[PDB]
Design a protein around this ligand. Structure first.
Ligand SMILES: COc1cccc(F)c1-c1cc2c(cn1)cnn2-c1cccc(N2CCN(C)CC2)n1
Length: 288
């Protein structure tokens, strides 16, 4: 679904949401339906070709699940690629917790369940996300949870190249990912570790060791006695939440549970985990 035309033929842009090295993200409205969408603009380089683009764009269409932002279409126009996707109006979990403060245990439990459903899908497709963190998990206005994309392997062209060249920030990375040159390699269970880190992030407003220099953190993950992190406050959280963190942050990947196994954990299988918990969080955001 690549159109060689101006995306403004089909969409009215409404707001510029964010930017980066990747490019620009916009809230837009479908001119027929009136439905909101997100439009992501990336600049095309002279090196880039439409044959490699079509294949990359095809995978965006097919790697489909309720807990991953849905792809609608793409536009190639004036050396800019626009990707059209499902709108998640509350932004990322980072956007939310930086305003609301720490999520409740039930809110975190719901988010973790929803992310794990996405991961179980991706892992079943033999895909490693590699980028699970609060900033890459979006919330729509109905309180539903969506991964921004299927992770590092969803990135296109020069953005993908940069992602391979620079491992980036290590705070959510499994130690086996950090140490891939030095020890033996990694697999999809790195995402489970990342989810454990994310649960702490939502609880405490930052991942463990966030005040330590990232090169120092990366270095410490190489050494034999790297200790998995823990929640700082004992009394605030249930035994189930502490145990969820313990098991997701299992140091040995051989012993770390799969996404589907984690979905049977007490924390994420308890009743009353629904989007209403996040509707309450968004009502708190709106009406502090
Ligand atoms: C982490 O999400 C991305 C990261 C890089 C490139 C992207 F296109 C996205 C991205 C954002 C998306 C969607 C898909 N992808 C779908 N809705 N939506 C959205 C909607 C409303 C507000 C808002 N934000 C999230 C990012 N903060 C910094 C600003 C507010 N985002």
């Amino acid at each position: 679904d690549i159109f060689n035309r101006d995306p403004r033929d089909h969409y009215d842009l409404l707001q510029r949401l964010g930017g980066g090295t990747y490019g620009e993200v916009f809230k837009a409205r479908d001119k027929v339906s009136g439905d909101l969408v997100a439009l992501k603009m990336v600049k095309m380089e002279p090196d880039d070709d439409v044959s490699t683009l079509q294949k990359e764009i095809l995978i965006l269409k097919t790697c489909r699940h309720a807990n991953i932002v849905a792809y609608h279409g793409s536009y190639l126009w004036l050396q800019k690629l626009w990707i059209c996707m499902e709108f998640c109006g509350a932004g990322s979990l980072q956007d939310i917790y930086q305003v609301t403060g720490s999520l409740s245990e039930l809110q975190i439990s719901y988010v973790c369940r929803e992310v794990l459903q996405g991961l179980a899908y991706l892992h079943s497709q033999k895909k490693i996300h590699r980028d699970i963190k609060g900033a890459n998990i979006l919330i729509n206005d109905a309180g539903e949870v969506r991964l921004a994309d299927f992770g590092i392997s969803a990135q296109i062209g020069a953005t993908l190249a940069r992602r391979l060249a620079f491992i980036g920030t290590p705070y959510w990375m499994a130690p086996e990912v950090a140490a891939v040159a030095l020890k033996g390699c990694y697999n999809e269970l790195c995402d489970i570790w990342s989810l454990g880190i994310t649960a702490i992030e939502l609880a405490e407003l930052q991942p463990p060791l966030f005040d330590v220099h990232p090169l120092r953190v990366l270095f410490l993950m190489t050494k034999s006695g790297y200790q998995p992190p823990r929640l700082k406050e004992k009394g605030k959280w249930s035994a189930a939440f502490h145990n969820f963190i313990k098991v997701t942050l299992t140091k040995s990947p051989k012993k770390r549970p799969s996404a589907t196994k984690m979905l049977s954990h007490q924390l994420v299988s308890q009743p009353g985990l629904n989007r209403g918990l996040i509707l309450d969080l968004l009502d708190k955001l709106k009406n502090p």
